[PDB]
Amino acid sequence: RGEHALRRYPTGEERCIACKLCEAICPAQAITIEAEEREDGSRRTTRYDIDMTKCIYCGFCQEACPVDAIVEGPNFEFSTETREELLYDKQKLLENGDKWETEIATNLRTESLYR
Amino acid sequence: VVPTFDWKKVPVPSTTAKDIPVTVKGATPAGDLRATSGLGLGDGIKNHTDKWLDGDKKSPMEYINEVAPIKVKGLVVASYGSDDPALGCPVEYINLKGTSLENPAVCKYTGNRYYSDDWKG
Amino acid sequence: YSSTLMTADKLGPGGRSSVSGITATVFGANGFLGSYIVNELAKRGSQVVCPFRSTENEAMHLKQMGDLGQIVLLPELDIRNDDDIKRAISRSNVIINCVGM
Amino acid sequence: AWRNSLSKSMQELRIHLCQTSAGSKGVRDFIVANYAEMKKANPHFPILIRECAGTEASLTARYDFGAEKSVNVQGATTGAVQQQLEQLILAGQSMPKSGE
Amino acid sequence: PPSDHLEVFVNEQPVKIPKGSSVLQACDAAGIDIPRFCYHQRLSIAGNCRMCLVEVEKVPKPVASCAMPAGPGMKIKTETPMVKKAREGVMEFLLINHPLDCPICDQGGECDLQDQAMIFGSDRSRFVEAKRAVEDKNLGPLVKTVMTRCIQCTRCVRFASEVAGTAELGVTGRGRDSEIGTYVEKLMGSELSGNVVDLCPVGALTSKPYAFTARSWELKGTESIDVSDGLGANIRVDARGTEVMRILPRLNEAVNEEWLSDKGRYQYDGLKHQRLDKPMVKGPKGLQVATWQDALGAAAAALTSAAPGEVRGIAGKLADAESMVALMDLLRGLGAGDLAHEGGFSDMPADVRSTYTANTTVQGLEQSDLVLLVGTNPRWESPVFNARLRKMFLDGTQVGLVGAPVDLTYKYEHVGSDPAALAALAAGQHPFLERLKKAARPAVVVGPGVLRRADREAVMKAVHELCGKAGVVKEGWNGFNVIHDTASRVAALDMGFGPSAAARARRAQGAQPKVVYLLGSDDYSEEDVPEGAFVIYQGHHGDRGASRANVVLPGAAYTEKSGLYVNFEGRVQQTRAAVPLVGDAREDWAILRALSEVVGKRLPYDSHAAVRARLAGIAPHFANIDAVQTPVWLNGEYVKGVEALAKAAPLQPSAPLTSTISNFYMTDAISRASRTMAKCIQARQQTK
Amino acid sequence: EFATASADYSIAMKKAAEITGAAESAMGPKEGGFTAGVPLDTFTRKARIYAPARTASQSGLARTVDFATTTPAWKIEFEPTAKWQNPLMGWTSSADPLENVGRSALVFYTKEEAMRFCEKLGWEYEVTEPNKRRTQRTKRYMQYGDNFGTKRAGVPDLSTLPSN
Ligand SMILES: NC(=O)C1=CN([C@@H]2O[C@H](COP(=O)(O)OP(=O)(O)OC[C@H]3O[C@@H](n4cnc5c(N)ncnc54)[C@H](OP(=O)(O)O)[C@@H]3O)[C@@H](O)[C@H]2O)C=CC1
Ligand code: SF4
Ligand code: SF4
Ligand code: SF4
Ligand code: SF4
Ligand code: FES
């Protein structure tokens, strides 16, 4: 359970559908979500924040997600010099997922036999 | 008796009428009411994607619009979003009758589009 | 302009998490008087921009003085360069000069 | 006649009563026997009859500049509340005037 | 009575119930809450969901408790093995074709199907076949359909037939392919069309403006009142921080039962646009932001430099009683008397409360067997009140109307359209008078469009003569009712917010004010606000009244304050703050108390309780919240008292008795700023 | 016979509330706030004692005053104070210490229990009685058999029959 990340389908569409289950289960209340409907009618988020200085790195959000959108990736080396660099918004989490997608998929090909 | 009401003579303020959030074709009729919340109103942002994406970066909506609809034989299709059902979305059963390449049916989880040439047409 | 500076954007009762509406640039903020002025502005919920010439170790005490995002630190200030002065005041409605010798 | 005088001394008259209480009987009799004649003399004078369950019978005169006086009339007869309205009329002459 | 309460046994406990009650009502009187999907209290019984199945002794089959009547000495069991097996089986049948849609569904978190599956169902499924897939339907801009989630309870069909009256939904097809909707592409045109979203127990019908924005567990709910009309429907406001997310009705059988019109439900998005959040003073550049001290000083300077006869104060449709009594006391303390109301008939006499309120009350009107409407359109003035009128129609109350003919979703007899027809009815030329004379409890409802007329006194005299001849008001029954369409009018009539005789004379000879105070007024006439006058606007939306003002003082909306409002039956109700004040706005009575201090004559009250006590000192019924007095009836003495107003401004027997509401979806500044109301109008314009 | 939730630990909770000596504990007005040790300006705020109505979205009655003796349903609520947005992230900020304490933690069986708590703590209170549900149905559609009655269009006239 490392740095949180947001994932896509192979087409390039976001997996997240703003169900707010990960926000409800979070014991630290480290997630803040706002949503409305997109211009094509889809149900998508407009804000998805994770306070990494409030997070406890439990993985409960990863368990609660029904579409495998939020994960905790294999990155542990993400120390910064300012605390404002650790208040992640939606764009940075998507950038993390776009960085770590192949490793996350390799990990999930094994861990889907157990979960 | 009971005269008809003329709705076309009802005045609407021009500031309100030009600011209605509407939709492109997608999963609705084009031009129906689009639900919005208050986020971005102070910064004057009326668009869904601009509320969290900054720059000329390729949006997720522009990614899914480049994938063509998929021809499926039958009347109902099951959508998982993956080859492996454990790795995708909960299964969505999408109606395919009355659908064509021009007016396909869209998955509410994945945004993939499907149509069938099997409903006697 | 008159008293719209202190009233128009004032949000919250006036603590560390509140908003006063002041964006200020303090020149010579790491000095003796400038540090106290920067503490006085930031504790009421004002954004304070602090350019400095010295090493970061001598300016680190200004980082504590305000909430997240409200203390802005700009190292390598050269006051013979107008670009640094232009960048440091580009969002401020208050400028305070404590530079002396 | 006191009824014609009841537009110059005061700006408004407010009557408070209970609908069923024994103490508001004389006030109700006064209103029933005198509202039409007090309104016929001046058709534009506001006479606010207001009722609530279990309240105290009271008369209130509003003068100019927002001034107000009150007299408690609970347990009074029709002649008695007539009298109390008449001293409410009398104090209206010694009030400062407005409008001009 | 021949034992009008019969005794049954629920789980060996004796229960007394009224006669004609079902098994489900007997279970409810025993403190057991039977699961249900198709039963509703306000609809007719259907009996098709099979979830309410209980066991009755000497019956080998489970009975449907919603439909089965309760007999004497009946023994009901609700916790035997066959009841639990029945509940699990019916739930399993309900879930085999349902889509796996809970993450994307808006009912998730407040779903009857989810919670009943968790409690009365199993934890597994054994179904691996393909499901039924259904295309979605278009029903307009307010109702969103995902029809794969339909469970065929037919609550929507019964609602549209019985309460809304439009009867436009049906079930097409047969068997597994049964399908709810309209066969052709149609728009749901009822004013009460948002209530069916509440009535649907699943996410088949959801609210389109609300869609995908919030979950129900995040919302802080506040019980408030509705101010979009004069009925004052009881509502619940759901907010997330500073933002109101939705508005829902709440139960009040004396006011609104369980309904709310689409304007009162969907106008909340106008609270996010054109909001006044700062004080402004007009300078040479124009209106610009100023401090509260500067704005109060400018308003006080203009209010004091003018003569007392050149000051006018106009109350808006949404001003609470505390701000209205504050403005009234402040203007009267300066020697002014020119008070006006944006809702019209400002010179109407307010001496007896029975002459401008509904004496029968809203729930007491159901005991009337014949109803005569005079010059009103209740479908556009109060659609919830019109729904209760349709409910009265469905169980035998006959309706007649004197006025312009309108669609009311029930059959009525058109007696006439003008005051000449009213006089002919009073004389005896129309046979509807004999129908009124033989009725046990006749009722007359007078709308606000009659009181806005210049000859309203003669019309009210004719109505009083008709009520005297037809026995409308007698011993034990008072059937005379006057309704309103604005939230603030009855409180202003209660406190005495009316112009003095000198001010009425000065308006008659054409005097023009120089200082105008606009207490939330944006629909003022041009005769009342002259050009070149000094305008002080106190309000919450930037509109017609704020674009013209010199001093703008930002106040609170009805979702941000707790003010008193009185509906047209005389009931004192109150709002509650669901969100805090926006920006640098203030409480509305507090602005006037501060302004009275800056002028130089302080108001004698410094708290919310003290201004409410001042209101109770003017009229004592203000202190009794959520209740209505029985108003005094003075027979024909009141009409005899105002005969001078009948002789002057004589009757106009040719002008039709009409309703003044020409735009139902946009009636005030909040609904004019709502994009949802504009889409509602555009949907009715693009259908032609 | 007596069976009012007679199969759970709530039997052992109703008694232990009526133990002698402890069932008659009482304090003077505002005295419990003096010994509470919280700042005294907290008791200048207003409280509301009310039982919240059923949500319109659902049909169940468990969180209502129908099950008042089984479940505590009366609440204490306070008026809102100022909120604003965080400049860096946009999160909702507040300075209210009583922002969620009445809605999360304080529940009472009756109205008088909540009044007693408010009186001993010093909070000034207003009490709102909930609106009572009506169970009697309309005259039309009173029973299931009234759906198919003769009240739809009257008794059928037998004048279109053959031989009239
Ligand atoms: N009693 C007093 O001290 C009085 C002070 N004042 C004035 O008040 C101000 C504050 O004084 P005080 O804080 O006591 O003095 P300090 O020396 O403590 O403050 C001077 C500040 O100016 C900066 N500075 C000086 N020269 C330069 C330069 N060439 N380029 C960039 N930055 C520079 C210094 O930064 P760095 O750390 O890099 O040198 C330092 O932070 C002074 O300007 C002084 O003239 C007036 C009257 C009395
Ligand atoms: S890992 Fe734990 S703390 Fe981090 S976002 Fe998920 S639930 Fe919250
Ligand atoms: S990340 Fe997953 S659980 Fe969280 S809101 Fe998006 S879809 Fe729901
Ligand atoms: S109606 Fe919606 S929330 Fe309820 S069970 Fe079905 S999909 Fe889930
Ligand atoms: S749409 Fe809703 S109310 Fe209508 S039949 Fe389906 S489940 Fe019932
Ligand atoms: S509730 Fe009785 S069968 Fe549906």
Q: List C-alpha distances in Å: E496 to B111, D11, D66, E349.
A: 62, 11, 13, 9
Under 8 Å CB-to-CB from E428, ≥6 apart: which residues?
A: none
- Output the furthest CA–CA distance in chain E (Å, rounded): 90
Interaxial angle between packed helices E608-618 and E321-333, expressed in degrees from 0 to 180 and rounded to the nearest 10: 80
* DSSP code, position E668: S
Nearest to A23 by CA among F84, B52, E218: E218
CA gap E622, E566 in Å, rounded: 9
What residues in E contact A19, CB-CB < 8 Å?
A: 102-104, 108
CA gap C56, C52 in Å, rounded: 9
Best to test chain A binding among E111, E144, E208, E215 (most A CBs inside 10 Å)? E215
Closest atom of ligand 1 to C32 CA is 13
For chain A, give the residues followed by a break (C–N over 2.5 Å): none
Q: Which run of H or of E encompasses E301?
A: helix E292-305
Nearest to E540 by CA among E581, E578, E577, E574: E581
Cβ < 6 Å from ligand 3: which residues? Answer: A 16-22, 33, 64-65, 67, 69-70
* Residue environment code for E123-142, b if the CB has 16+ CB neighbours within 10 A, otherwise e: eeeeeeeebebbbbbbbbbb
In this structure, the residue with its CA closest to atom 24 of ligand 1 is C99
Closest atom of ligand 5 to E199 CA is 3
Nearest to D21 by CA among D55, D62, D59, D71: D55
> ∠ at Cα E263 (E259, E266), nearest 5°?
90
What residues in E contact D97, CB-CB < 8 Å?
A: none
Go through chain B and tell me how many residues it has: 121
Q: Which two tokens stand for residue C53?
A: 């010439």
Please give the full DSSP string across D46-62, using - where no structure is assigned: -EEEEE-TT---EEEEE
CA gap E422, E445 in Å, rounded: 13
Find, in chain E, the residue whose alpha carbon is nearest to that of D11: E500
* Residue environment code for E244-270, b if the CB has 16+ CB neighbours within 10 A, otherwise e: bbbbbbbbbebbbbbbbbbbbbbbbbb
Instruction: Tell me how far the alpha carbon of residue E103 lies from the centroid of ligand 2, in angstroms.
Output: 19
* Residue environment code for F132-146, b if the CB has 16+ CB neighbours within 10 A, otherwise e: ebeeebbebbbbbeb
Instruction: Tell me how far the alpha carbon of residue E576 lies from the centroid of ligand 3, in angstroms.
Output: 34
Ligand nearest to the CA of A16: 3
Indicate the SS3 state at residue E364: helix
- Going F21 to F23 to F24 to F26, the CA torsion angle's sign is positive
Under 8 Å CB-to-CB from E436, ≥6 apart: which residues?
A: E370, E372, E442, E470, E471, E472
Q: Which run of H or of E encompasses E459?
A: helix E456-470
A59 annotated as belonging to a binding site for a ligand: no
What residues in E contact B12, CB-CB < 8 Å?
A: 666, 678, 681-682
CA gap E395, E366 in Å, rounded: 10
Q: How was this structure determined?
A: cryo-EM
First to last CA, chain B: 47
Ligand nearest to the CA of E137: 5
A26 annotated as belonging to a binding site for a ligand: yes
Question: What is the distance in angstroms between the Cα of E436 and the nearest Cα belonging to chain F?
Answer: 22
- R_g (Cα) of chain D, nearest Å: 13
Find, in chain B, the residue whose alpha carbon is nearest to that of A15: B110
Q: Which run of H or of E encompasses E684?
A: helix E675-685
Instruction: Tell me how far the alpha carbon of residue F53 lies from the centroid of ligand 4, in angstroms.
Output: 23
B35 inside 8 A of chain A by CB: yes
- Return left, alpha or beta for F23; rule: phi > 0 is left, psi -120 to 50 is alpha, else beta: alpha
Go through chain D and tell me how many residues it has: 100
Indicate the SS3 state at residue E339: strand
Question: What is the distance in angstroms between the Cα of E546 and the nearest Cα belonging to chain C?
Answer: 19
Instruction: Provide φ and ψ at E562, rounded to 5°.
Output: -115, 85
Ligand nearest to the CA of E52: 6
For ligand 4, mutation pick of E96, E104, E113 (most atoms within 8 Å of CB): E113
Nearest to E362 by CA among E514, E110, E500, E569: E569
Torsion of CA C1, C7, C9, C15, to 10 degrees: 130
Interaxial angle between packed helices D78-90 and D25-41, expressed in degrees from 0 to 180 and rounded to the nearest 10: 50
Cβ < 6 Å from ligand 6: which residues? Answer: E 36-39, 47-52, 64, 66
- Return left, alpha or beta for C6; rule: phi > 0 is left, psi -120 to 50 is alpha, else beta: alpha
CB distance F52–E581 less than 8 Å? no
The separation between CA B79 and the C-alpha centre of its own chain, rounded to angstroms, equals 17
Q: Which two tokens stand for residue E493?
A: 């009539």
What residues in E contact B44, CB-CB < 8 Å?
A: none
Under 8 Å CB-to-CB from C49, ≥6 apart: which residues?
A: C23, C24, C25, C26, C72, C74, C88, C89, C91, C92
CA gap E397, C17 in Å, rounded: 62
* DSSP code, position E6: E
Interaxial angle between packed helices E81-95 and E112-120, expressed in degrees from 0 to 180 and rounded to the nearest 10: 140
Chains that touch D (3 or more CB pairs under 8 A): E
* DSSP code, position E572: E
E strand map for E66-191? 75-77, 143-145, 170-172, 179-181
CA gap E628, A99 in Å, rounded: 67
In this structure, the residue with its CA closest to atom 38 of ligand 1 is C54
Q: Which residues of C are annotated as a binding site?
A: 30, 32-33, 53, 98, 100
Q: What is the 3-state secondary structure (H, E, C) of chain C?
A: CCCCCCCCCCECCCCCCCECCCEEEEECCCCHHHHHHHHHHHCCCCEEEEECCCCHHHCHHHHHHCCCCCEEEECCCCCCCHHHHHHHCCCCCEEEECCCC
Q: With beta carbons less than 8 A apart as the criterion, state whether A100 and A49 touch.
A: no
Do β-strands E170-172 and E179-181 pair in parallel, antiparallel, or remain unpaired?
A: antiparallel
> ∠ at Cα E491 (E487, E495), nearest 5°?
160
Resolution (A): 2.5
Q: How many helices (H) and strands (E) does chain E have?
A: 23, 28
E strand map for chain D? 12-17, 47-51, 58-62, 68-72
Find, in chain F, the residue whose alpha carbon is nearest to that of E12: F1
A86 annotated as belonging to a binding site for a ligand: no
Instruction: Provide φ and ψ at D8, rounded to 5°.
Output: -100, -35
Location of structure tokens 């005379």: E480
CB distance F136–E234 less than 8 Å? no
Q: With beta carbons less than 8 A apart as the criterion, state whether E659 and E404 touch.
A: yes
CA gap E257, E414 in Å, rounded: 28
Instruction: Tell me how far the alpha carbon of residue A115 lies from the centroid of ligand 5, in angstroms.
Output: 36
CA gap C22, C50 in Å, rounded: 14
The runs of H, that is alpha helices, within A1-115 are 21-25, 60-64, 90-111
First to last CA, chain E: 59
Closest atom of ligand 1 to C33 CA is 13
- Going E544 to E545 to E551 to E553, the CA torsion angle's sign is negative
E strand map for F16-123? 46-50, 74-78, 83-85, 92-94, 107-108
Instruction: Provide φ and ψ at B93, rounded to 5°.
Output: -100, 115
In this structure, the residue with its CA closest to atom 8 of ligand 5 is E153
Q: With beta carbons less than 8 A apart as the criterion, state whether E120 and E35 touch.
A: yes
Find, in chain F, the residue whose alpha carbon is nearest to that of E111: F58
Instruction: Provide φ and ψ at B70, rounded to 5°.
Output: -110, 130
CA gap B99, F133 in Å, rounded: 48
CA gap E13, D98 in Å, rounded: 75
CA gap D94, E317 in Å, rounded: 38
CA gap E329, E597 in Å, rounded: 13
Q: List C-alpha distances in Å: E460 to E351, E423, E450.
A: 15, 11, 8
CA gap B49, B27 in Å, rounded: 17
Q: Which residues is E370 bridged to in the sheet?
A: E398, E442
Q: Collect all residues from C whose CB is shorter than 8 A from any CB in A.
A: 68-69
Amino acid at E686: Q
Q: How many CB atoms lie within 10 A of CB D46?
A: 20
Nearest to E534 by CA among E349, E215, E304, E379: E304
